[PDB]
Design a binder for this molecule. Structure first.
Ligand SMILES: Nc1ncnc2c1ncn2[C@@H]1O[C@H](COP(=O)(O)O)[C@@H](OP(=O)(O)O)[C@H]1O
Ligand SMILES: Nc1ncnc2c1ncn2[C@@H]1O[C@H](COP(=O)(O)O)[C@@H](OP(=O)(O)O)[C@H]1O
Ligand code: VO4
Ligand code: VO4
Lengths: 282, 282
């Protein structure tokens, strides 16, 4: 059941398994040099995670082991916090939490953070398939039904709108880098150099080019460490939908009927009205 | 997936292909002098004796974390070897491997070991439900169909007969304790004192009493650490059949039709003809 699996937690619909032991996330102890990589689900977290990991590093363990998913928790089988506690510094932390739910210690230690977003319509499409692929998540009755929920913020991790706005505001901090999926798509070289500098490293052709080559869609698909094939089918059924699905901009055009798009875009307007964030023109 | 797509014959032993894909990790496993191996044929009471032994170690977390399942492996999500490599000594190792497949390092380091067996007919019954509960294991068409496979050793971990016989011979070693599920059922205090001494500890009446009270079936069935409820339903569906199912002797009488029992028992006699193992009369 949808609401048997998901429950509102502090104003944010969440996977009850991630909030059962919330005290572990709340009291999580951050380290000065921890780097937080935050995104709303399906905005390209895997992509920027690999880029950042490559920068740090100047049969490879799954990305979910290399970069622990902070709040991910499934009783005693899966525990991101446990992984992070045993991870040697500098730790790279992945999260989908809105600023209000992120462990306060990260803000307190003034940790560098990288927030990545993607245009809402394309997020909704990728998110829709994500729900299909996750065996324990009830499959939406249809894309439209799912979009209605997406607009209401009635999906895991809540409102995409509140998520982006809050993080955008947090990005006022020079230690919180705000990025766009579409910018990495339309101008990767620049975004990579930007990241390398934000992380205080010397950008060289060798480094930038190795990263660009290694992080292309085709390359990350085909990479077992990043395509999530190292993750049990009983959990993530990629037969339903692969993780590295399309990796393009504008897939919403193949899913949003005319009516829904106009309704979605109108709603978007109302939501992001007073938000100065600059998404790339399509 | 078909039965033989999931299971494959490995060095004469039908195995879960996921446990043999990276066999080199098991084969080259490095044992430590003080490692204690707890070996059993699936569904013979491994959880029971594991908890008893653990309690002895702590002088009165999920058990699969406290006592790593050596060869268990599911790509990068589950890895017993990885767990053991990070486990501080003295390590307690769980395994269902026949002596010929057990990492040679254990024999080389002459590690103490505890082998536990259960009467074949009751093992087959418990094993049958185990197959039903494991989501990724094809459910037998019927108990009979499953028993035919069991007699042929065409089930994960192979022939129960070869398993018991080989380990029985290995038990000649004073450092390899051979025990029976039915003995723990009919006389736990003795079996507990026996274990406490094998592990070189003092069998106080208080300690023995603690263990007996804590390792009863009714207790472990309600202990989340041992009833495997700390393990995702997507993997182990206890709704199909609970782990702590019955915990009795003779459940075969409720499953083996007359014909099958006579056929099974006849086969058993030819398989075990020259085995001096003393199974408890029931
Ligand atoms: N190197 C890359 N280039 C382009 N898109 C990528 C990518 N790596 C991951 N993605 C895309 O990011 C989405 C997964 O999101 P996340 O990593 O946040 O969970 C998928 O979107 P699509 O479903 O639209 O294809 C996936 O294809
Ligand atoms: N404390 C206990 N007392 C009696 N039986 C126990 C027990 N703990 C586990 N078992 C039994 O051991 C079997 C599980 O085997 P294993 O632990 O090796 O996988 C189950 O058998 P049944 O299916 O007959 O009920 C289970 O109920
Ligand atoms: O948004 V994702 O990186 O958990 O699939
Ligand atoms: O035989 V068991 O202890 O892996 O289920």
């Amino acid at each position: 059941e949808y609401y048997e699996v998901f429950g509102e937690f502090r104003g944010v619909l969440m996977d009850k398994r991630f909030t059962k032991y919330w005290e572990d996330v709340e009291m999580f102890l951050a380290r000065p040099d921890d780097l937080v990589i935050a995104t709303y689900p399906k905005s390209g977290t895997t992509w920027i995670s690999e880029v950042v990991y490559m920068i740090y590093k100047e049969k490879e363990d799954a990305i979910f082991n290399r970069i622990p998913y902070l709040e991910c928790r499934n009783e005693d089988l899966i525990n991101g916090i446990k992984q992070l506690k045993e991870k040697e510094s500098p730790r790279i932390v992945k999260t989908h939490l809105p600023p209000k739910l992120l462990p306060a210690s990260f803000w307190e230690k003034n940790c560098k953070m990288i927030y990545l977003c993607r245009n809402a319509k394309d997020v909704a499409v990728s998110y829709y398939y994500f729900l299909l692929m996750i065996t324990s998540y009830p499959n939406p009755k249809s894309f439209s039904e799912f979009v209605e929920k997406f607009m209401q913020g009635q999906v895991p991790y809540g409102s995409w709108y509140d998520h982006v706005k809050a993080w955008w505001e947090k990005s006022k901090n020079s230690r919180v880098l705000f990025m766009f999926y579409e910018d990495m798509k339309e101008d990767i070289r620049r975004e990579v150099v930007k990241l390398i500098e934000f992380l205080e490293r010397k950008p060289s052709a060798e480094l930038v080019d190795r990263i660009i080559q290694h992080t292309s869609f085709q390359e990350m698909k085909n990479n077992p460490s990043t395509n999530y094939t190292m993750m049990p089918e009983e959990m993530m059924n990629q037969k339903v939908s692969p993780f590295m699905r399309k990796g393009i901009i504008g897939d919403w055009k193949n899913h949003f009927p005319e009516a829904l798009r106009e309704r979605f875009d109108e709603h978007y307007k109302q939501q992001m009205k007073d938000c100065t964030v600059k998404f790339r023109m399509e």
